[PDB]
Amino acid sequence: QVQLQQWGAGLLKPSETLSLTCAVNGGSFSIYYWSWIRQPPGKGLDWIGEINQSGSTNYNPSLKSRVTMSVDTSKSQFSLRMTSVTAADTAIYYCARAPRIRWGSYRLKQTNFDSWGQGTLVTVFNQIKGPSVFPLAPSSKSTSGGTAALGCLVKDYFPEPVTVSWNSGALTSGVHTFPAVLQSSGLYSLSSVVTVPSSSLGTQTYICNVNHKPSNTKVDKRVEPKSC
Amino acid sequence: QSALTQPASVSGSPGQSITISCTGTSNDVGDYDYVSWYQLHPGKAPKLLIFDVSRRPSGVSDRFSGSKSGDTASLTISGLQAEDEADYYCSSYTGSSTYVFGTGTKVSVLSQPKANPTVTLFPPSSEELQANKATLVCLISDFYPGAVTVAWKADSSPVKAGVETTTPSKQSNNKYAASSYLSLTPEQWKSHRSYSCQVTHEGSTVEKTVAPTE
């Protein structure tokens, strides 16, 4: 196998053009195909397409309207262009080798991928945007342990990251802040939750402090029970 | 072409043997010998384990073995070791001169005893609803191994649109937590008797339900 080095701008806005490049070290294009593959944060792998050193290309049927690949024999580089991106194109983009060979006339071997680059993380969204913060009032879902869960929903922000404290940093025990999910919007949401004793509800105060530094948004939200 | 179907999650204890299936069609797995298998550790690049259904590159442990019967290829991992905990993907060349991938399988090597998740489902807050939005929040905690699937239900009908779910990660105790979100309009929230979060873990499902009338 070979060593693939890849680069290109990974921060895009809707309708722009992704342009990534991969460089071959430790071999040459030879008779092989050279490919682009992506991994969106939810989904599994998507094969994007391939190219050989003579310029023959084969593309994924659902992406070919927007995708074209190029090769630069002189530099030992091949490229991906994908126009009119949306948040549906957000993903880690890998280049790789597809070293297919014929064995006689009807027989292909090494139908695999093998020289996988390290990946380029591409995100697609319009602008910096601060979160909307809502309370997650205590639900009491461990009867045996007499414990409740309460929290804050940190919704629809871009880009990462967001930091959540509780009670201006005095409350860390029992806190768990989840990784963000990426929504179809291209915006992120996350939640932070505290496991507390049920008897504390309504006497102890719980306030979550959300700071999304990318947008200089700080929000404090009190989280109180719904009903006694 | 259509993604190869894999199981979402497979687990085993160290020393165990496990198999991961990968189901396609006539045009990929079935009529050809074009199946590959890759191991993906978080943040590392994919690694080839098996190609042409059953050939192993030199440098891949012989604990890894591939095979095919009908439209289903299978990757067997013998003598499970903790380093084998990763995501696994199959792939195939096709008779239409394309490649397709599998949907991916999370392999867990049980280093600790199994722990069932605790599920806590939050309805939309009044504040979110006044803002003409609604999000249901399903919090999943205190479980091991760190693999789950989450299904949402409106009444008894499956909800697929507007679902996002995180990959499990460790809490400060040493068990896992995950989270799933259902985005709805206030109208859809009010328009049903209940919504449920269904959390499937190691062969068992825990369900929680909220209602716009509570």
Tab-separated table of C-alpha atoms in Angstrom:
chain	number	residue	atom	x	y	z
A	1	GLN	CA	0.000	0.000	0.000
A	2	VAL	CA	0.780	3.753	-0.043
A	3	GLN	CA	0.609	6.854	2.168
A	4	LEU	CA	-2.076	9.420	1.364
A	5	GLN	CA	-1.777	13.008	2.568
A	6	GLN	CA	-4.891	15.139	2.198
A	7	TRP	CA	-5.879	18.765	2.677
A	8	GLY	CA	-8.362	21.440	1.687
A	9	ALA	CA	-10.720	23.881	3.334
A	10	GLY	CA	-13.216	22.124	5.601
A	11	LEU	CA	-15.362	25.094	6.772
A	12	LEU	CA	-17.968	25.860	4.103
A	13	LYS	CA	-21.285	27.717	3.733
A	14	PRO	CA	-24.330	26.357	1.879
A	15	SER	CA	-24.040	26.461	-1.933
A	16	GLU	CA	-20.216	26.654	-1.904
A	17	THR	CA	-17.731	24.183	-3.452
A	18	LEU	CA	-15.814	21.604	-1.465
A	19	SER	CA	-12.335	21.217	-2.917
A	20	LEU	CA	-10.074	18.587	-1.333
A	21	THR	CA	-6.700	17.237	-2.462
A	22	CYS	CA	-4.818	14.012	-1.793
A	23	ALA	CA	-1.088	13.443	-2.432
A	24	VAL	CA	0.475	10.030	-3.067
A	25	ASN	CA	3.737	9.179	-1.245
A	26	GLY	CA	5.422	5.773	-1.448
A	27	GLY	CA	4.092	4.733	-4.839
A	28	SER	CA	2.383	6.039	-7.937
A	29	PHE	CA	-1.013	6.067	-9.659
A	30	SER	CA	-0.004	3.022	-11.734
A	31	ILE	CA	-2.959	1.049	-13.012
A	32	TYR	CA	-5.087	1.710	-9.964
A	33	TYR	CA	-8.151	3.733	-9.100
A	34	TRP	CA	-8.109	6.538	-6.554
A	35	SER	CA	-11.127	7.301	-4.508
A	36	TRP	CA	-12.980	9.629	-2.175
A	37	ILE	CA	-15.187	8.268	0.642
A	38	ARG	CA	-17.097	10.063	3.386
A	39	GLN	CA	-18.403	9.306	6.857
A	40	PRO	CA	-21.274	11.578	8.010
A	41	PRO	CA	-21.628	11.826	11.797
A	42	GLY	CA	-24.798	9.700	11.808
A	43	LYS	CA	-24.467	7.465	8.841
A	44	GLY	CA	-21.952	4.913	7.793
A	45	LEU	CA	-19.551	5.244	4.847
A	46	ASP	CA	-20.567	6.690	1.469
A	47	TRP	CA	-18.501	5.905	-1.622
A	48	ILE	CA	-18.193	9.160	-3.529
A	49	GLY	CA	-16.316	8.041	-6.660
A	50	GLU	CA	-12.985	7.188	-8.246
A	51	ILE	CA	-10.481	8.217	-10.894
A	52	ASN	CA	-7.486	6.580	-12.597
A	53	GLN	CA	-4.394	8.323	-13.946
A	54	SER	CA	-5.847	8.499	-17.469
A	55	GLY	CA	-8.890	10.428	-16.183
A	56	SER	CA	-11.543	7.711	-16.303
A	57	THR	CA	-14.024	8.368	-13.498
A	58	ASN	CA	-16.907	6.464	-11.892
A	59	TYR	CA	-19.187	8.266	-9.435
A	60	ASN	CA	-21.787	7.512	-6.825
A	61	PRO	CA	-25.211	7.729	-8.568
A	62	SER	CA	-26.687	9.999	-5.856
A	63	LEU	CA	-23.733	12.429	-5.890
A	64	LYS	CA	-22.620	12.563	-9.511
A	65	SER	CA	-24.681	15.673	-10.351
A	66	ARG	CA	-22.391	17.674	-8.057
A	67	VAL	CA	-19.088	15.749	-8.004
A	68	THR	CA	-16.071	15.842	-10.304
A	69	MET	CA	-12.592	14.442	-9.698
A	70	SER	CA	-9.307	15.439	-11.284
A	71	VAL	CA	-5.790	14.012	-11.349
A	72	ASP	CA	-2.415	15.708	-11.646
A	73	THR	CA	0.075	13.047	-12.791
A	74	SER	CA	3.009	15.474	-12.602
A	75	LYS	CA	2.382	16.128	-8.905
A	76	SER	CA	0.986	12.682	-7.982
A	77	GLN	CA	-2.176	14.373	-6.686
A	78	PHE	CA	-5.880	13.747	-7.196
A	79	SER	CA	-8.767	16.004	-6.225
A	80	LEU	CA	-12.454	16.077	-5.277
A	81	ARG	CA	-14.769	18.962	-6.202
A	82	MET	CA	-18.350	18.910	-4.887
A	83	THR	CA	-20.503	21.914	-5.766
A	84	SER	CA	-23.634	23.320	-4.063
A	85	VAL	CA	-22.948	21.783	-0.674
A	86	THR	CA	-25.499	21.658	2.136
A	87	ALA	CA	-25.374	20.379	5.694
A	88	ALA	CA	-26.152	16.965	4.225
A	89	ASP	CA	-22.531	16.965	2.991
A	90	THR	CA	-21.081	17.453	6.495
A	91	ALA	CA	-18.742	14.566	7.139
A	92	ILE	CA	-15.185	13.356	7.407
A	93	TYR	CA	-13.855	12.998	3.832
A	94	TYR	CA	-11.185	10.341	3.280
A	95	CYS	CA	-9.112	9.573	0.223
A	96	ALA	CA	-8.004	6.011	-0.448
A	97	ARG	CA	-6.630	3.625	-3.083
A	98	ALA	CA	-8.857	1.104	-4.912
A	99	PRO	CA	-6.139	-1.228	-6.349
A	100	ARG	CA	-8.447	-3.315	-8.594
A	101	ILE	CA	-6.639	-5.618	-11.020
A	102	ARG	CA	-7.740	-8.012	-13.742
A	103	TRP	CA	-6.681	-11.635	-13.387
A	104	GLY	CA	-7.771	-13.062	-16.716
A	105	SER	CA	-10.766	-11.654	-18.696
A	106	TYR	CA	-13.793	-11.908	-16.368
A	107	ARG	CA	-11.990	-11.827	-13.055
A	108	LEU	CA	-11.243	-8.822	-10.844
A	109	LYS	CA	-9.205	-8.994	-7.623
A	110	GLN	CA	-8.195	-6.532	-4.893
A	111	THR	CA	-11.696	-5.009	-5.073
A	112	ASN	CA	-11.015	-3.328	-1.681
A	113	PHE	CA	-9.782	0.059	-0.462
A	114	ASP	CA	-6.450	0.292	1.256
A	115	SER	CA	-4.433	3.445	1.527
A	116	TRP	CA	-6.769	5.434	3.589
A	117	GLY	CA	-5.859	9.051	4.221
A	118	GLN	CA	-6.417	10.426	7.706
A	119	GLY	CA	-9.570	12.345	6.771
A	120	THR	CA	-10.702	15.952	6.448
A	121	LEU	CA	-13.557	17.144	8.657
A	122	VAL	CA	-16.029	19.243	6.650
A	123	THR	CA	-18.841	21.226	8.229
A	124	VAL	CA	-21.423	23.265	6.319
A	125	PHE	CA	-23.455	26.088	7.809
A	126	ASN	CA	-24.387	29.700	7.155
A	127	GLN	CA	-23.203	31.767	10.173
A	128	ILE	CA	-22.134	31.723	13.798
A	129	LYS	CA	-25.264	31.252	15.941
A	130	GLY	CA	-25.808	31.118	19.690
A	131	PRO	CA	-27.965	28.516	21.419
A	132	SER	CA	-31.537	28.665	22.674
A	133	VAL	CA	-31.551	27.331	26.252
A	134	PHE	CA	-34.506	25.574	27.862
A	135	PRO	CA	-34.966	23.810	31.206
A	136	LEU	CA	-35.458	20.042	31.532
A	137	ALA	CA	-37.490	20.001	34.734
A	138	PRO	CA	-36.756	17.137	37.146
A	139	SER	CA	-38.104	13.747	36.257
A	140	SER	CA	-37.754	11.228	39.076
A	141	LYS	CA	-36.600	8.022	37.354
A	142	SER	CA	-34.940	5.937	39.994
A	143	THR	CA	-37.445	4.957	42.684
A	144	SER	CA	-35.094	2.469	44.355
A	145	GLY	CA	-32.355	5.075	44.640
A	146	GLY	CA	-34.663	8.040	45.410
A	147	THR	CA	-32.866	10.070	42.738
A	148	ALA	CA	-34.077	12.506	40.082
A	149	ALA	CA	-32.585	13.869	36.844
A	150	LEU	CA	-32.830	17.522	35.806
A	151	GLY	CA	-30.994	19.408	33.141
A	152	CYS	CA	-30.747	22.004	30.392
A	153	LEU	CA	-31.355	21.652	26.674
A	154	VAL	CA	-28.877	23.722	24.668
A	155	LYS	CA	-30.426	23.991	21.225
A	156	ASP	CA	-29.572	25.058	17.671
A	157	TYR	CA	-26.076	26.577	17.844
A	158	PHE	CA	-23.045	26.790	15.561
A	159	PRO	CA	-20.058	26.094	15.596
A	160	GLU	CA	-18.904	23.842	18.406
A	161	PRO	CA	-18.074	23.995	21.290
A	162	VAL	CA	-20.449	24.896	24.157
A	163	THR	CA	-19.485	24.721	27.831
A	164	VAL	CA	-22.092	24.187	30.559
A	165	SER	CA	-21.493	24.810	34.238
A	166	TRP	CA	-23.998	24.465	37.058
A	167	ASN	CA	-24.454	26.988	39.864
A	168	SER	CA	-21.587	29.125	38.533
A	169	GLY	CA	-19.224	26.156	38.872
A	170	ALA	CA	-20.022	25.150	42.458
A	171	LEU	CA	-22.018	22.114	41.273
A	172	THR	CA	-19.904	19.492	39.492
A	173	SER	CA	-20.833	16.278	41.296
A	174	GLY	CA	-23.439	14.267	39.387
A	175	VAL	CA	-23.207	16.452	36.279
A	176	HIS	CA	-22.967	14.882	32.833
A	177	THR	CA	-22.838	16.984	29.662
A	178	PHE	CA	-23.453	14.978	26.473
A	179	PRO	CA	-21.714	15.306	23.110
A	180	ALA	CA	-23.599	17.442	20.639
A	181	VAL	CA	-25.792	15.973	17.979
A	182	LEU	CA	-25.640	17.464	14.516
A	183	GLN	CA	-29.068	18.243	13.135
A	184	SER	CA	-30.214	18.235	9.516
A	185	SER	CA	-30.106	22.019	9.823
A	186	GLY	CA	-26.340	21.924	10.228
A	187	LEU	CA	-26.839	23.384	13.721
A	188	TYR	CA	-25.915	21.534	16.885
A	189	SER	CA	-27.798	20.728	20.047
A	190	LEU	CA	-26.736	19.177	23.335
A	191	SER	CA	-28.032	18.585	26.868
A	192	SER	CA	-26.435	18.654	30.321
A	193	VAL	CA	-28.008	16.740	33.200
A	194	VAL	CA	-27.618	16.462	36.948
A	195	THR	CA	-28.523	13.405	39.006
A	196	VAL	CA	-29.649	14.760	42.381
A	197	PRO	CA	-31.519	13.360	45.384
A	198	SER	CA	-35.310	13.701	45.111
A	199	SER	CA	-35.525	15.304	48.553
A	200	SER	CA	-33.344	18.178	47.321
A	201	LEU	CA	-35.873	19.269	44.696
A	202	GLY	CA	-37.440	22.604	45.570
A	203	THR	CA	-34.997	23.369	48.384
A	204	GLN	CA	-31.637	23.279	46.587
A	205	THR	CA	-31.399	25.655	43.626
A	206	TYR	CA	-30.154	24.482	40.243
A	207	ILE	CA	-29.094	26.948	37.544
A	208	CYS	CA	-27.222	25.975	34.385
A	209	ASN	CA	-24.690	28.427	32.946
A	210	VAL	CA	-24.360	28.016	29.198
A	211	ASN	CA	-21.436	29.734	27.477
A	212	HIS	CA	-21.118	29.432	23.725
A	213	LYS	CA	-17.851	31.339	23.287
A	214	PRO	CA	-17.997	31.334	19.459
A	215	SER	CA	-20.957	33.749	19.664
A	216	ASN	CA	-20.254	35.365	23.059
A	217	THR	CA	-23.540	33.956	24.335
A	218	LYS	CA	-23.810	33.326	28.082
A	219	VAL	CA	-27.196	32.187	29.413
A	220	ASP	CA	-28.279	31.214	32.920
A	221	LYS	CA	-31.491	29.151	33.210
A	222	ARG	CA	-33.077	28.159	36.503
A	223	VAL	CA	-34.335	24.578	36.539
A	224	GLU	CA	-37.162	24.015	38.997
A	225	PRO	CA	-39.656	21.177	39.429
A	226	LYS	CA	-42.958	21.250	37.595
A	227	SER	CA	-45.382	20.138	40.356
A	228	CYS	CA	-45.727	19.121	43.989
B	1	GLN	CA	-26.748	0.934	-4.908
B	2	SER	CA	-28.229	0.077	-1.515
B	3	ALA	CA	-26.159	-0.099	1.652
B	4	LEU	CA	-25.233	-3.551	2.868
B	5	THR	CA	-27.169	-4.458	5.993
B	6	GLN	CA	-25.098	-5.178	9.113
B	7	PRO	CA	-26.191	-5.597	12.723
B	8	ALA	CA	-25.913	-2.391	14.707
B	9	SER	CA	-24.108	-3.947	17.664
B	10	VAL	CA	-22.303	-7.196	18.519
B	11	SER	CA	-20.695	-7.976	21.866
B	12	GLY	CA	-18.593	-10.750	23.362
B	13	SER	CA	-16.305	-11.446	26.280
B	14	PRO	CA	-12.528	-11.747	25.788
B	15	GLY	CA	-11.622	-15.172	24.427
B	16	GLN	CA	-14.970	-15.449	22.675
B	17	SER	CA	-15.506	-15.739	18.910
B	18	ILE	CA	-18.048	-13.448	17.241
B	19	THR	CA	-19.451	-13.056	13.753
B	20	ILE	CA	-20.658	-9.958	11.906
B	21	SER	CA	-22.966	-10.401	8.929
B	22	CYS	CA	-23.258	-8.119	5.892
B	23	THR	CA	-26.251	-8.703	3.616
B	24	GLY	CA	-26.510	-7.410	0.049
B	25	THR	CA	-28.048	-8.506	-3.207
B	26	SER	CA	-27.399	-10.498	-6.371
B	27	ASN	CA	-25.433	-7.608	-7.770
B	28	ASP	CA	-22.831	-7.246	-5.022
B	29	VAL	CA	-22.335	-9.885	-2.334
B	30	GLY	CA	-24.357	-12.561	-4.094
B	31	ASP	CA	-22.893	-13.086	-7.548
B	32	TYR	CA	-19.343	-11.827	-6.921
B	33	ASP	CA	-16.413	-12.275	-4.620
B	34	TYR	CA	-15.906	-8.534	-3.971
B	35	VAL	CA	-16.435	-8.106	-0.211
B	36	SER	CA	-14.080	-6.202	2.117
B	37	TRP	CA	-14.050	-5.584	5.856
B	38	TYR	CA	-12.598	-2.558	7.680
B	39	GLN	CA	-11.906	-1.756	11.314
B	40	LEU	CA	-12.465	1.868	12.399
B	41	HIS	CA	-11.169	3.105	15.785
B	42	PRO	CA	-12.394	6.553	16.822
B	43	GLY	CA	-10.362	9.224	15.097
B	44	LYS	CA	-8.037	6.705	13.411
B	45	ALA	CA	-8.290	5.973	9.733
B	46	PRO	CA	-10.137	2.866	8.515
B	47	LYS	CA	-7.960	-0.276	8.428
B	48	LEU	CA	-8.367	-3.122	5.943
B	49	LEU	CA	-8.823	-6.552	7.515
B	50	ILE	CA	-10.243	-8.736	4.711
B	51	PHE	CA	-10.649	-8.383	0.947
B	52	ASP	CA	-11.960	-10.579	-1.873
B	53	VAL	CA	-14.325	-12.111	0.701
B	54	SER	CA	-11.666	-14.073	2.525
B	55	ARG	CA	-8.116	-12.903	1.762
B	56	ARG	CA	-6.198	-11.423	4.704
B	57	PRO	CA	-3.433	-8.843	4.121
B	58	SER	CA	-0.160	-9.750	5.755
B	59	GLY	CA	-0.097	-7.838	9.046
B	60	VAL	CA	-3.703	-8.639	9.942
B	61	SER	CA	-3.970	-11.189	12.756
B	62	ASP	CA	-5.282	-14.589	11.646
B	63	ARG	CA	-8.002	-14.181	14.304
B	64	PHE	CA	-9.854	-12.337	11.502
B	65	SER	CA	-11.595	-14.447	8.884
B	66	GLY	CA	-14.089	-13.764	6.113
B	67	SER	CA	-16.628	-15.871	4.230
B	68	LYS	CA	-19.818	-15.687	2.199
B	69	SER	CA	-22.966	-17.793	1.767
B	70	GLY	CA	-25.643	-16.541	-0.590
B	71	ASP	CA	-26.280	-12.806	-0.341
B	72	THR	CA	-24.596	-12.664	3.113
B	73	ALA	CA	-20.882	-12.219	3.798
B	74	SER	CA	-19.567	-12.652	7.298
B	75	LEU	CA	-16.557	-11.481	9.270
B	76	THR	CA	-15.507	-13.782	12.129
B	77	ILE	CA	-13.331	-12.485	14.977
B	78	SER	CA	-11.848	-15.347	17.009
B	79	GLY	CA	-10.300	-15.069	20.430
B	80	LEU	CA	-11.744	-11.626	21.098
B	81	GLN	CA	-9.221	-9.173	22.558
B	82	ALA	CA	-9.975	-5.780	24.074
B	83	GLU	CA	-8.192	-4.018	21.200
B	84	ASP	CA	-10.909	-5.413	18.901
B	85	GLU	CA	-13.491	-2.987	20.365
B	86	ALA	CA	-14.220	-0.739	17.376
B	87	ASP	CA	-16.646	-0.059	14.522
B	88	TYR	CA	-16.582	-2.559	11.633
B	89	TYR	CA	-17.754	-1.915	8.066
B	90	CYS	CA	-18.123	-4.170	5.083
B	91	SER	CA	-17.920	-3.009	1.508
B	92	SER	CA	-18.390	-4.462	-1.942
B	93	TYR	CA	-17.640	-3.730	-5.532
B	94	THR	CA	-20.710	-4.276	-7.689
B	95	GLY	CA	-21.758	-5.370	-11.169
B	96	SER	CA	-22.674	-1.732	-11.899
B	97	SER	CA	-18.984	-0.709	-11.420
B	98	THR	CA	-19.595	1.069	-8.113
B	99	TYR	CA	-18.721	0.390	-4.475
B	100	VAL	CA	-21.293	0.212	-1.673
B	101	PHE	CA	-20.666	0.055	2.081
B	102	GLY	CA	-22.366	-1.636	4.997
B	103	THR	CA	-24.228	0.316	7.689
B	104	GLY	CA	-21.631	-0.561	10.326
B	105	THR	CA	-21.424	-2.719	13.447
B	106	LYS	CA	-20.165	-1.593	16.865
B	107	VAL	CA	-18.200	-4.413	18.495
B	108	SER	CA	-17.987	-4.341	22.282
B	109	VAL	CA	-15.541	-6.527	24.196
B	110	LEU	CA	-17.081	-6.985	27.645
B	111	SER	CA	-14.400	-5.783	30.095
B	112	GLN	CA	-17.044	-5.265	32.836
B	113	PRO	CA	-20.331	-6.999	33.660
B	114	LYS	CA	-23.408	-5.900	31.754
B	115	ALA	CA	-25.373	-2.953	33.150
B	116	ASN	CA	-28.906	-2.109	32.031
B	117	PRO	CA	-29.654	1.508	31.046
B	118	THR	CA	-31.851	3.817	33.072
B	119	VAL	CA	-34.113	5.798	30.767
B	120	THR	CA	-35.508	9.256	31.508
B	121	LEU	CA	-37.710	10.977	28.922
B	122	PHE	CA	-38.360	14.768	29.098
B	123	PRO	CA	-41.349	16.337	27.328
B	124	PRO	CA	-41.053	19.762	25.711
B	125	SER	CA	-40.703	22.581	28.184
B	126	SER	CA	-43.426	25.236	28.393
B	127	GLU	CA	-40.740	27.770	27.443
B	128	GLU	CA	-39.886	25.882	24.255
B	129	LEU	CA	-43.560	25.555	23.342
B	130	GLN	CA	-44.266	29.287	23.834
B	131	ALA	CA	-41.392	29.702	21.292
B	132	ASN	CA	-43.353	27.570	18.734
B	133	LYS	CA	-40.934	24.615	19.007
B	134	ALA	CA	-40.883	21.278	20.772
B	135	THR	CA	-38.077	18.796	21.484
B	136	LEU	CA	-38.429	15.501	23.316
B	137	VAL	CA	-35.216	14.517	25.132
B	138	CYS	CA	-34.452	10.864	25.965
B	139	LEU	CA	-31.566	10.481	28.412
B	140	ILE	CA	-29.958	7.080	28.725
B	141	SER	CA	-27.604	6.403	31.584
B	142	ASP	CA	-25.707	3.908	33.694
B	143	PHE	CA	-25.282	1.192	31.084
B	144	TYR	CA	-22.513	-1.115	29.781
B	145	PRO	CA	-21.407	-1.922	27.151
B	146	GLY	CA	-21.651	1.414	25.375
B	147	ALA	CA	-23.895	0.461	22.471
B	148	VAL	CA	-27.617	1.197	22.095
B	149	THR	CA	-30.265	1.653	19.448
B	150	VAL	CA	-33.123	4.111	20.019
B	151	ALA	CA	-36.520	3.994	18.351
B	152	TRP	CA	-39.191	6.630	18.764
B	153	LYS	CA	-42.945	6.005	18.566
B	154	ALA	CA	-45.849	8.425	18.126
B	155	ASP	CA	-48.829	6.559	19.588
B	156	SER	CA	-47.782	3.090	18.283
B	157	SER	CA	-46.498	4.327	14.925
B	158	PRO	CA	-42.740	4.611	14.277
B	159	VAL	CA	-41.251	8.091	14.071
B	160	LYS	CA	-38.198	8.393	11.813
B	161	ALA	CA	-38.030	12.104	10.900
B	162	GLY	CA	-36.380	14.592	13.237
B	163	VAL	CA	-34.496	11.995	15.330
B	164	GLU	CA	-30.870	12.509	16.337
B	165	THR	CA	-29.009	10.254	18.771
B	166	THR	CA	-25.472	10.548	20.224
B	167	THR	CA	-22.841	7.797	20.350
B	168	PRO	CA	-22.504	6.570	23.946
B	169	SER	CA	-19.703	7.984	26.086
B	170	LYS	CA	-18.478	7.363	29.596
B	171	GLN	CA	-19.917	9.145	32.631
B	172	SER	CA	-17.846	9.895	35.761
B	173	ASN	CA	-18.852	6.580	37.206
B	174	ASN	CA	-17.464	4.132	34.711
B	175	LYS	CA	-20.757	3.273	32.848
B	176	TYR	CA	-22.102	4.894	29.693
B	177	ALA	CA	-24.763	7.472	28.895
B	178	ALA	CA	-26.328	8.489	25.590
B	179	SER	CA	-29.035	10.845	24.377
B	180	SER	CA	-31.691	11.035	21.665
B	181	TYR	CA	-33.780	13.964	20.517
B	182	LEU	CA	-37.101	14.140	18.712
B	183	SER	CA	-37.893	17.527	17.179
B	184	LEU	CA	-41.598	18.196	16.582
B	185	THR	CA	-43.837	21.152	15.955
B	186	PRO	CA	-46.212	22.087	18.802
B	187	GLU	CA	-48.990	20.864	16.531
B	188	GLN	CA	-47.520	17.381	16.160
B	189	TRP	CA	-46.837	17.182	19.888
B	190	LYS	CA	-50.452	18.016	20.689
B	191	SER	CA	-51.807	15.829	17.870
B	192	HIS	CA	-51.012	12.437	19.448
B	193	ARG	CA	-51.959	10.580	22.622
B	194	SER	CA	-48.352	9.884	23.551
B	195	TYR	CA	-44.725	9.657	22.353
B	196	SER	CA	-42.319	6.927	23.475
B	197	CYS	CA	-38.554	6.497	23.556
B	198	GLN	CA	-37.499	2.856	23.061
B	199	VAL	CA	-33.935	2.013	24.103
B	200	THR	CA	-32.580	-1.367	23.024
B	201	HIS	CA	-29.467	-2.616	24.815
B	202	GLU	CA	-27.908	-6.100	24.768
B	203	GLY	CA	-31.078	-7.748	23.511
B	204	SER	CA	-33.604	-5.974	25.779
B	205	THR	CA	-35.678	-2.824	25.340
B	206	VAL	CA	-36.606	-0.179	27.909
B	207	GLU	CA	-39.471	2.170	27.006
B	208	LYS	CA	-40.581	5.538	28.434
B	209	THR	CA	-43.593	7.586	27.418
B	210	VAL	CA	-44.715	11.218	27.704
B	211	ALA	CA	-48.011	12.798	26.685
B	212	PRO	CA	-49.092	16.338	25.755
B	213	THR	CA	-51.959	15.943	28.236
B	214	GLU	CA	-49.848	15.310	31.368
